[PDB]
């Protein structure tokens, strides 16, 4: 009943079936898409969201195209590109008379009204931003949108009567850990900070061959390579610029409060989670009931690794943090060997032996190996420097100020069935692009 | 007859069938819920409680929502949030005429009456707290509520006529042992003290990568790391703040007395106990019959561990207690190897060998190994420092005061078929949140 | 024909079938009860007692509730609490008309008469103590009651016409041996002296984690750790306070005499004995025929162990006696290796090898191993220090007083098919709790 454009022999099919046990996921490959897993997950997410909400509900579809929202019986108001709008108009024109069970005549009239007056708020389409839109609804969908501030957009939806919001996208946990780069290997996705795009051995990088004869000159002293706001995502071959702050804003706590002219008590729950791709359900309710701990929890069905790795960016040897997702079976099969101190070479050989058909992508096997090795070493150190129960050894420094020694932590390894917990903000109170040729082109197809 | 939203191949299905032999537990997975085991246990607990109590009984449903109690033939008066109330109203409106065997018309009238006047005490719903509620009933249910003071709530229910109360929730034994952190691994649950949330190797923590170059300073001197009242539970990805005193208050003794204007003799018995999740039955009777020993007993079907562990909280190497549950088969299979002194590495290798499908979650295996190792060592010490029968070696210290030497106890290991016994209090005598927009929203659906 | 609430795969089914060969014991598990074995044994004991005594007999049921004694055709005068009384009233009200073959109308009238005048001695119910009761009967049943003085209760029953009494409960032999703690592993039962409740490695204990840095001070000098009267039993999760003297009083000799206003010659025989749970038959006959040796004999179908063990109570390393029951097959399989001196570690490894499904509970395996080891050592000493036949080496000490050397006895091992014999007393001549709210509650259901 639900068909996914993936190969029938894909190992991701089992994971996607586990993530959606309510459907009968059937592989029907029609394209060689290199980010087919992400598309299949997003399609299944949209099907699940539609199944969850009432049929009589109007759905704000933030940051999307109506072309993919026309073959449905739900009232999708698509508020968010020119190519996608042209495709939506073309699909309207090519199905104007073939089927009439999707309000295609009404959608065509709505599009004509919008292209007539761009400020029109027709029930099925809008050209304003999620902030500038004023079409009241009760359900909001955020499918693969990351360049919007989460509390601001959620508040602007809530004041329009939206009580339920859905966010589909990659897990925000790697950016709350503040990794320099990282991978969602199951979805062929690699993201990197703009500063490390010239690296060598990460997922999303390109470097040139050099002999290292001349030491490159720079007008500025770096002396610090820590993550900056700009990041680049590559889902298959699709490139997307993102902001770290806008990504982290979507790492919402379990409870938060939007205070303004109207106040809302909102709850964020991750309802779907498959190998780095999450569907979060946000329930908004007017009022300021309860209290907020400002804590966001990410459960880990699969292992999550943030490891220090040494690469060469533009030929310069540097060290930075790299995140990755390790399959739960690989993490479980490494439990015994991580009891002792294992070298990265032995860890990598063991991972390759356990990966034999590959359970996990091999390009992350080396760094993961390093991570595991470091983790094991660190654990041994923790077992070799056992302290006393309920005491600390902070020393006085010439004043009333007390200081302790921080240990070398080169690996954060969240094993399967663990939970990462982050201190985030839970109280928020700080909340015309149409052109003549595009209008002419749209009208020519209507 | 009883269907649980868990995978048909779940190893927890056998344990849940064992915990509820009276029902035919059938796995019917419909959601990918990451805390599905806890939900299934709670659903089976509610089914068993309903089966136990008389059909003609009024049930006080404390700290819950009626959005999960309408599809029953039993008079559930729900006293305890905004989204859950909205879901209750939605479910009443969507099934107002479809089914008329659940007093849905009466429930809708009661909800409208409560909306008209928030102090109304309709037989099926109330908006007050359990203290503020005054609807007389004979049965109380405490499903997954831990933020209430147990003797106070029980007294306020008893003076309302409640003779039978049921408490469904995680076992309170770990908090009677004063563990800093702990796991209910079977339910994908990890709880941690707020102080150790920045740890590295516990179930519920998040730490950053550091080089240990700058020693972090602090305004105040810690010098002590003992559990504080504030703890955080993560059931799957669901985050709940809890108070240690409120959690311990529900570790009631077998017999206790509530003394006040009316006096009650209450008995607390654990009627269901599956791998860290307990259903407790409290029978309250007016009068002060008998005497109270002030002892609470927990039977351990599976192994219970509280072990000293060394981790890094915010990079500072510290030691604190961590609790966990070990499957009884794992504990029995470790009996022979614990006869000698085993290193944590060998213990972890043996545990991994015994875990081969995993009997226990692997993320608990390392610390468990440490615990077992320490336990073995301690036992050997006890066998190497054999004292004389019925004598003690307390020495005199310059006065009439006698002192003895305490031994290093780094592991409390309650084996399967053992009982932990705690001295608790057994004599107790020290016993308007509605908003206009919520009222309008609820009334819009009625 | 007799159904027991235990698992069909329970290994206790075979033992219970052997203990009751006259019944067809069928496992019908309906509850996950952690002390299901003890309940099944007690139910079979009551069935056998009923099958033994004549149908025309009135049965005094001492220290019990009628909520378990109405579904029978035998006249049960229940003399003994509030919750059980309410349960009995509820069961009477819920079966008043459905079944009329159990004299339920008469039972209801009797309960109403007792609630009218609390001194009434209705044939089927009483509110007085077993001493204050005056309803004549010929059969008395003491099911799981240990807080009454055995000769006093037996005499007060005998002067009321009781010629036959039945006592069902845990074997009193461990308390005649004066063990500090002990286990009935087959019934998931662990008992401990109040002083050793803060132990670490016994069945019923709880201790905390300590670094053993500060030596705890005490106002009093212990200098002795001997059993005190107060003990605590844990049957599964059910906690019972008990008196050592009251428990020992039920370790009656095979023949004893109750002398007073009326004199009786009584005989105590253990008619059922399963792995620590016994049913004793006491036959009372007026007159003082015969003579009493003052000896109580316990036959051991399975091994009984009282061994010195070293634990830490509240961190203090102490040694005290621990008792346990070892399966006869384990004891027989241990005969060969006990011919030599075996270490506790080797003994524990061998016991684990023999326990492979576990024949015995694993948490008793270590101490038992120690026991066995010590026993073997002691036996070797007895063989290495062979004396002369019919001579003793008592030495004179500056007086007419002779002294011998007592040997180290750290293990009492009563093997299967042996008998312990204790010197006990055999000549005994030293022999209003109702509340208004309870009366109103009972009357409301009648
Ligand atoms: N990081 C990031 N990923 C995105 C973003 N938008 C979409 N994606 C993901 O990247 C994939 C590529 O997007 P598209 O080229 O539009 O593919 P599509 O969404 O299936 O639609 P088509 O173009 O018709 O195939 C999508 O499947 C999304 O899962 C974005 O803004 N940021
Ligand atoms: N520690 C703790 N656990 C809780 C608390 N409330 C509920 N839980 C458990 O955590 C799980 C998550 O709660 P919910 O998100 O409400 O799930 P639910 O109770 O099954 O109801 P739904 O949201 O409809 O799924 C529940 O299954 C409970 O077993 C709480 O207050 N404290
Ligand atoms: N040591 C000791 N054990 C007891 C005593 N009374 C009962 N027991 C045992 O402990 C078990 C627990 O008692 P209960 O909770 O009343 O269980 P029950 O007798 O089967 O009756 P229910 O409560 O209906 O299950 C019983 O099965 C008895 O075998 C007692 O006074 N002292
Ligand atoms: Zn719009
Ligand atoms: Zn109410
Ligand atoms: Zn009587």
Numbering used by the authors:
A (entry chain Q), B (entry chain O), C (entry chain M): 3 to 82, 89 to 364, 376 to 450, 458 to 472
Give the text the authors published on this PDB structure:
NsP1 is the membrane anchor for the complex, forming dodecameric pores that associate monotopically with the membrane in the necks of the spherules to gate their entrance. Enzymatically, nsP1 also has a role in addition of cap0 structures to the 5′ end of the positive-sense viral RNAs. NsP1 possesses both N′7 methyltransferase and guanylyltransferase activity and reverses the order of these reactions. Each nsP1 protomer is built around a methyltransferase fold common to SAM-dependent methyltransferases with additional insertions (membrane binding and oligomerisation (MBO) loops 1 and 2) and extensions (ring aperture membrane binding oligomerisation (RAMBO) domain) that contribute to pore formation, oligomerization, and membrane binding.
